[PDB]
Amino acid sequence: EAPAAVVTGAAKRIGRAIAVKLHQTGYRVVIHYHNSAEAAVSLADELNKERSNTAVVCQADLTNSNVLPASCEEIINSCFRAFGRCDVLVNNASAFYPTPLVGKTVETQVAELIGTNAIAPFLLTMSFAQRQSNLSIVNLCDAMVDQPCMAFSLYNMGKHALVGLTQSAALELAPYGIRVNGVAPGVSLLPVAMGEEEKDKWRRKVPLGRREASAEQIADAVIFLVSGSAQYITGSIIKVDGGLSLVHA
Amino acid sequence: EAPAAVVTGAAKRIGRAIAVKLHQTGYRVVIHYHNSAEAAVSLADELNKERSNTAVVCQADLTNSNVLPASCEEIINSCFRAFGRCDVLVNNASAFYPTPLVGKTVETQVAELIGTNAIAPFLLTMSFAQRQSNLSIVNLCDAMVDQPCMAFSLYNMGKHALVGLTQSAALELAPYGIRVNGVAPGVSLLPVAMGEEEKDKWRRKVPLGRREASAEQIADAVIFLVSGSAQYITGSIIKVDGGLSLVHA
Amino acid sequence: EAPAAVVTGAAKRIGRAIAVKLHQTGYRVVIHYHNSAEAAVSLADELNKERSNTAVVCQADLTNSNVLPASCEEIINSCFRAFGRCDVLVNNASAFYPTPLVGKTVETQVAELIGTNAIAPFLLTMSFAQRQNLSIVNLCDAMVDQPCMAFSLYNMGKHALVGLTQSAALELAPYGIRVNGVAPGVSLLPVAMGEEEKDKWRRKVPLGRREASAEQIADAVIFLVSGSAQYITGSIIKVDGGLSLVHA
Amino acid sequence: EAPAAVVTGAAKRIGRAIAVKLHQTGYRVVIHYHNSAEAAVSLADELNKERSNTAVVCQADLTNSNVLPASCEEIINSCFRAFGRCDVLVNNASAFYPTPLVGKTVETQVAELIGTNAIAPFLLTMSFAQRQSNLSIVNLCDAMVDQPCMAFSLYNMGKHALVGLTQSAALELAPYGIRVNGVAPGVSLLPVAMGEEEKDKWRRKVPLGRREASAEQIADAVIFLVSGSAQYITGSIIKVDGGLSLVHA
Numbered sequence: 001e002a003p004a005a006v007v008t009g010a011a012k013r014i015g016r017a018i019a020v021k022l023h024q025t026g027y028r029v030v031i032h033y034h035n036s037a038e039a040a041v042s043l044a045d046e047l048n049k050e051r052s053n054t055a056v057v058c059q060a061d062l063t064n065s066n067v068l069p070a071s072c073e074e075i076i077n078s079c080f081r082a083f084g085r086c087d088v089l090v091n092n093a094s095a096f097y098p099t100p101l102v103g104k105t106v107e108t109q110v111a112e113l114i115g116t117n118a119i120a121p122f123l124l125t126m127s128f129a130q131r132q133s134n135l136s137i138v139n140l141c142d143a144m145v146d147q148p149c150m151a152f153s154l155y156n157m158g159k160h161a162l163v164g165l166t167q168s169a170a171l172e173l174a175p176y177g178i179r180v181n182g183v184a185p186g187v188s189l190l191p192v193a194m195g196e197e198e199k200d201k202w203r204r205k206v207p208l209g210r211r212e213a214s215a216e217q218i219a220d221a222v223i224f225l226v227s228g229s230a231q232y233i234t235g236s237i238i239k240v241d242g243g244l245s246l247v248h249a
Numbered sequence: 250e251a252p253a254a255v256v257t258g259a260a261k262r263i264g265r266a267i268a269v270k271l272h273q274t275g276y277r278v279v280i281h282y283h284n285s286a287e288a289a290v291s292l293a294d295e296l297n298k299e300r301s302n303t304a305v306v307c308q309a310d311l312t313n314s315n316v317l318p319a320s321c322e323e324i325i326n327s328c329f330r331a332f333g334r335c336d337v338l339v340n341n342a343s344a345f346y347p348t349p350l351v352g353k354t355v356e357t358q359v360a361e362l363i364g365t366n367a368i369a370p371f372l373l374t375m376s377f378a379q380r381q382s383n384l385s386i387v388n389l390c391d392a393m394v395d396q397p398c399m400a401f402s403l404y405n406m407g408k409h410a411l412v413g414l415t416q417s418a419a420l421e422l423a424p425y426g427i428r429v430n431g432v433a434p435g436v437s438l439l440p441v442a443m444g445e446e447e448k449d450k451w452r453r454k455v456p457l458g459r460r461e462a463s464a465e466q467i468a469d470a471v472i473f474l475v476s477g478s479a480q481y482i483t484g485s486i487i488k489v490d491g492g493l494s495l496v497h498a
Numbered sequence: 499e500a501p502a503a504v505v506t507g508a509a510k511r512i513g514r515a516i517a518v519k520l521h522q523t524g525y526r527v528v529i530h531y532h533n534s535a536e537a538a539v540s541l542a543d544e545l546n547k548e549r550s551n552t553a554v555v556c557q558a559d560l561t562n563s564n565v566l567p568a569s570c571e572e573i574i575n576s577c578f579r580a581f582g583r584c585d586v587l588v589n590n591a592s593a594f595y596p597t598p599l600v601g602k603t604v605e606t607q608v609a610e611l612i613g614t615n616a617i618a619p620f621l622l623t624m625s626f627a628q629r630q631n632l633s634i635v636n637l638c639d640a641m642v643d644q645p646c647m648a649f650s651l652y653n654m655g656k657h658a659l660v661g662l663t664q665s666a667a668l669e670l671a672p673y674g675i676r677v678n679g680v681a682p683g684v685s686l687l688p689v690a691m692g693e694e695e696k697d698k699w700r701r702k703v704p705l706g707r708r709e710a711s712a713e714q715i716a717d718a719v720i721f722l723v724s725g726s727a728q729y730i731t732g733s734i735i736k737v738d739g740g741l742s743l744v745h746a
Numbered sequence: 747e748a749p750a751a752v753v754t755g756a757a758k759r760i761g762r763a764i765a766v767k768l769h770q771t772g773y774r775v776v777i778h779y780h781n782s783a784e785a786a787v788s789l790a791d792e793l794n795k796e797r798s799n800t801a802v803v804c805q806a807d808l809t810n811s812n813v814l815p816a817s818c819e820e821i822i823n824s825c826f827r828a829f830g831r832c833d834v835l836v837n838n839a840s841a842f843y844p845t846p847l848v849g850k851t852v853e854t855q856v857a858e859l860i861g862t863n864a865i866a867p868f869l870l871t872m873s874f875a876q877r878q879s880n881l882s883i884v885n886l887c888d889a890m891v892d893q894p895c896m897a898f899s900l901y902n903m904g905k906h907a908l909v910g911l912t913q914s915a916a917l918e919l920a921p922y923g924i925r926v927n928g929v930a931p932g933v934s935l936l937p938v939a940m941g942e943e944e945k946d947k948w949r950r951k952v953p954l955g956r957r958e959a960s961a962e963q964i965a966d967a968v969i970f971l972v973s974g975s976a977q978y979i980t981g982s983i984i985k986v987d988g989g990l991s992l993v994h995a
């Protein structure tokens with residue numbers, strides 16, 4: 001029997017590439033999405049086309065609420081329903097927008113940023129662990145957590161909490177054989193709304209090659225961490241940033 | 250005229266000492282509390298018996314919710330109402346209990362621990378910044394954030410986000426002359442629930458002195474960080490642990 | 499054309515496993531050693547038996563001195579001599595003994611611990627860069643921030659290795675050279691250590707209550723020098739089973 | 747009886763401020779220097795004109811060689827001979843220049859930067875500890891240890907090693923009551939040879955004020971760390987950088 005993997009926010013960009021590669025490795029995937037219903041579905045269609053019944057979709061909002069614990073348990077549940085097992089969880093879904101200190105209200109901002117980046121990953125880990133070889137969770141972190149974007153404080157707090165969850169969960173879930181690790185991109189696929197002038201300014205800052213990471217480059221770190229080549233690695237966070245975090249002001 | 254400072258969860262223990270020492274320095278203090286009402290009024294009495302009209306009390310629940318932004322704004326507004334100014338905010342109040350991955354429900358456990366330790370300090374920082382000449386914020390952190398206690402995931406996640414806030418708030422509030430900094434205790438006042446055998450067990454781990462810190466010793470770093478001796482210090486976290494975090498397993 | 503790798507202190511233990519792994523991946527290796535002459539050669543025979551003209555030995559002391567720059571240039575040189583090219587450098591050789599503040603003279607201890615753990619790696623990096631998927635892998639320590647008692651000099655050299663890994667990555671990026679690290683917690687324990695002492699250490703490890711096998715440390719090195727890491731540089735990968743996360 | 751302190755490379759700039767400040771505090775100081783003879787002697791005169799028998803000088807080259815251990819032993823000795831005690835050690839002397847990986851030969855470059863920044867501090871610490879109440883060492887570090895200058899390999903290797911000495915020594919010397927701590931400037935006094943265009947360029951990168959630190963601001967961190975307000979503090983490194991380390995590329 002093949003193994004299975006939940007990948008959150010897998011309809012587009014880095015998440016898509018993670019799923020495509022995990023699928024290519026022989027994993028049966030659960031494709032989580034929120035708004036991108038069309039891309040999510042046509043991907044699962046594409047993945048099923050060359051291996052029958054190996055992909056399923058699952059929609060949830062991961063924003064913080066009194067219903068998030070239930071939302072998160074269903075996503076883990078979907079994997080056991082579809083495939084009868086859950087071997088890998090990839091926490092990838094993420095809200096990313098400015099929240100300056102000086103349309104959405106602040107309580108919405110808090111819920112969306114802390115919810116997607118930290119709280120949901122925590123509950124998804126709880127469910128993952130409680131529903132239980134090569135079992136392992138992978139969190140998509142940030143290489144620049146200590147040299148952050150201006151006015152992106154709430155986002156930063158969430159990414160900082162993701163590091164704390166990764167280390168905490170790694171410690172607790174080790175006696176059960178569950179490895180928790182992280183993958184921290186510097187600058188990868190730039191936001192779809194980013195203009196070519198502001199995209200290239202960030203490129204010129206990258207020591208290794210003067211470009212952003214492909215999604216496939218980030219996905220390769222995930223594959224390594226879930227492979228049998230990482231049987232002794234837990235609580236680790238792998239930067240994939242082309243040395244960008246080493247560059248001073 | 251005397252400067253004014255608000256210290257959260259300051260009825261008892263480490264917060265008490267921080268307010269006491271800030272008062273002795275010459276500050277007018279706001280003593281925020283949650284449950285410990287009787288100790289909060291008793292402290293305000295002693296501080297006003299020393300100097301008339303220099304201390305006020307302010308009850309608030311810092312548990313995460315949609316009304317918290319208003320709660321945190323209120324606390325900042327009590328200070329501006331009592332003393333006509335707010336110079337220093339000390340984020341001290343914190344929930345601390347285990348939340349295992351394998352009475353209170355998880356959505357309560359999330360709201361309390363991420364609320365008190367991270368989100369509340371973020372909202373207080375907004376209101377402080379908003380209401381605005383040696384201006385500084387001091388967040389009470391944790392030295393052991395990278396070697397956390399077992400089954401203490403939500404708390405650790407919170408404390409980690411406080412590092413992210415201290416870092417991001419410092420950078421953004423820098424052109425307004427507001428310094429954001431942190432103080433990280435190893436083991437200080439041990440919890441009231443802990444037995445004498447378990448407290449001793451932790452004391453023997455400490456390299457410097459084989460004992461915990463007094464709250465006076467934690468407060469001392471706070472006074473430093475808000476003094477005119479730290480004018481160029483911002484985004485810094487002063488570990489006050491007696492080398493505890495250096496000890497390997 | 500088969501690619502070529504230099505691996506320091508590769509006669510036995512972790513270094514031997516990194517050489518064996520790189521050979522099986524299809525690399526031509528340079529087995530460096532200090533005192534273990536018989537083991538380095540006996541390894542080279544076993545690798546040349548599988549593939550003719552693929553392994554060589556190279557002796558050098560990496561203890562700091564005014565001749566060390568030359569010693570290191572020669573190790574690089576022996577690679578270009580035997581194989582015509584130099585693709586990978588694994589900084590693995592390391593002195594490890596207590597040097598308390600309160601047999602060897604202090605200036606020997608300094609020489610051996612700072613030379614092998616930091617200064618030699620720095621020099622091999624210059625020579626590797628000067629002589630030119632090119633990548634350097636520096637073997638570090640997961641416990642650099644939670645050090646062993648009375649082991650100051652060792653920790654100083656391991657801390658300086660992190661510093662080199664970062665600074666080299668930054669400068670050698672425009673040349674397409676990737677500098678990275680693998681940081682073991684507790685792996686193959688000293689020869690040399692008692693059995694009751696080794697069990698006390700094993701019981702500390704969250705994942706398995708065992709130390710890392712040499713081959714498990716080798717796996718992370720194989721990753722960093724592969725095409726799967728094309729974008730990774732200035733990174734240090736903990737391979738420690740959660741050791742660095744355990745409080746006292 | 748007044749306490750005594752050793753301060754390396756104390757003739758001009760930062761180390762001069764530490765010395766002057768330690769003097770105003772009440773310490774008897776040993777002004778170490780290497781090449782600034784007139785500057786070191788001139789300072790001793792000004793400090794002695796204030797309080798008689800409080801300031802002496804000690805010339806030494808701290809570049810690494812076989813005769814370095816005895817040199818460092820002699821500096822520690824100077825203090826004990828002039829004052830009959832040694833309470834505080836400030837490791838300040840530092841070589842700072844490029845060492846590209848692609849006049850001075852390489853082995854001379856290794857000797858100076860590693861020697862001044864790390865090996866000397868280790869030997870001075872040994873001798874300080876061997877010779878032995880508020881006993882403390884303070885190492886001058888770098889806030890930018892993780893975002894280094896281009897082609898400053900050896901120097902940055904040195905300041906990294908300095909952080910490891912601060913931690914290993916703090917752990918080992920704790921049973922004795924010797925606290926080892928650090929002070930990490932971002933940009934204080936800029937190099938004398940640096941151009942005013944390049945000086946302003948580094949200044950405008952600083953979040954808090956858009957200017958470098960006064961040497962006296964750095965000194966304030968040293969003073970705090972050797973004081974009774976820092977009794978429980980050991981193994982700590984205080985950044986004093988105006989938030990420079992937090993600014994991304």
Ligand SMILES: NC(=O)c1ccc[n+]([C@@H]2O[C@H](COP(=O)([O-])OP(=O)(O)OC[C@H]3O[C@@H](n4cnc5c(N)ncnc54)[C@H](OP(=O)(O)O)[C@@H]3O)[C@@H](O)[C@H]2O)c1
Binds near residue numbers: 034190
């Ligand atoms: N891109 C970079 O340069 C970069 C840099 C550093 C770190 N990273 C990290 O790597 C990961 C992937 O990066 P990315 O650029 O691919 O990110 P992204 O496109 O902005 O976000 C990934 C997905 O998360 C989902 N999502 C957003 N908000 C959600 C919500 N409130 N509830 C549930 N799902 C939500 C979205 O799916 P739907 O459209 O279907 O809603 C989206 O496709 C992220 O964790 C990110 O933080 C990326």
Ligand SMILES: NC(=O)c1ccc[n+]([C@@H]2O[C@H](COP(=O)([O-])OP(=O)(O)OC[C@H]3O[C@@H](n4cnc5c(N)ncnc54)[C@H](OP(=O)(O)O)[C@@H]3O)[C@@H](O)[C@H]2O)c1
Binds near residue numbers: 283309340341
């Ligand atoms: N003590 C240590 O060994 C240690 C170690 C590391 C870090 N720290 C940090 O140092 C700071 C102070 O330590 P501590 O031991 O004095 O803390 P603590 O006594 O355990 O808690 C501090 C205060 O927080 C208030 N509080 C609790 N829940 C709250 C809520 N839901 N909403 C608003 N306020 C709430 C309480 O006030 P009421 O009683 O009035 O409800 C309490 O007095 C904390 O940030 C702590 O995490 C302490």
Ligand SMILES: NC(=O)c1ccc[n+]([C@@H]2O[C@H](COP(=O)([O-])OP(=O)(O)OC[C@H]3O[C@@H](n4cnc5c(N)ncnc54)[C@H](OP(=O)(O)O)[C@@H]3O)[C@@H](O)[C@H]2O)c1
Binds near residue numbers: 512560591592
């Ligand atoms: N083993 C662990 O638990 C552990 C933990 C953390 C990090 N590491 C790191 O991983 C790497 C390998 O560990 P290991 O246990 O395999 O190492 P090791 O046995 O302690 O040393 C490896 C080799 O280094 C060479 N060497 C020693 N002193 C030298 C000198 N003065 N000049 C030149 N070469 C010298 C020796 O070669 P010869 O025998 O030929 O003389 C030795 O075989 C090391 O860099 C270490 O720092 C290991």
Ligand SMILES: NC(=O)c1ccc[n+]([C@@H]2O[C@H](COP(=O)([O-])OP(=O)(O)OC[C@H]3O[C@@H](n4cnc5c(N)ncnc54)[C@H](OP(=O)(O)O)[C@@H]3O)[C@@H](O)[C@H]2O)c1
Binds near residue numbers: 759780783839886
């Ligand atoms: N300036 C900055 O922006 C900055 C930034 C970060 C950290 N720091 C750290 O802060 C400390 C002081 O800074 P600084 O700018 O005042 O340093 P500095 O002016 O560059 O040099 C400090 C002193 O060290 C002595 N010295 C140089 N080479 C020596 C050698 N080979 N042997 C013995 N002594 C030697 C010199 O004394 P003589 O002139 O008498 O020969 C010099 O005055 C240093 O440890 C530095 O690493 C400075």
Ligand SMILES: N#Cc1c(-c2ccc3c(c2)OCO3)[nH]c2nc(N)[nH]c(=O)c12
Binds near residue numbers: 142
């Ligand atoms: N650009 C960018 C992003 C970053 C990012 C990239 C480069 C940075 C950064 C954040 O901090 C400073 O350097 N993080 C993101 N997370 C999500 N979910 N989506 C994104 O687009 C990004």
Ligand SMILES: N#Cc1c(-c2ccc3c(c2)OCO3)[nH]c2nc(N)[nH]c(=O)c12
Binds near residue numbers: 343344393397438440
């Ligand atoms: N003991 C303890 C506490 C700790 C603590 C003590 C020792 C530790 C620790 C947290 O992480 C591992 O080592 N954090 C606390 N926070 C609050 N609010 N109250 C507490 O009592 C503690």
Ligand SMILES: N#Cc1c(-c2ccc3c(c2)OCO3)[nH]c2nc(N)[nH]c(=O)c12
Binds near residue numbers: 591592644683686
């Ligand atoms: N054991 C061990 C070693 C360690 C080591 C092992 C366990 C540790 C450690 C270092 O820090 C605290 O936990 N570092 C070494 N370096 C070399 N060169 N050779 C070794 O054997 C070790």
Ligand SMILES: N#Cc1c(-c2ccc3c(c2)OCO3)[nH]c2nc(N)[nH]c(=O)c12
Binds near residue numbers: 248842
């Ligand atoms: N400028 C500068 C210096 C720095 C320095 C300044 C700015 C930096 C830095 C080091 O890291 C990147 O940003 N370190 C120094 N050490 C000595 N001994 N003397 C100096 O002048 C400096």
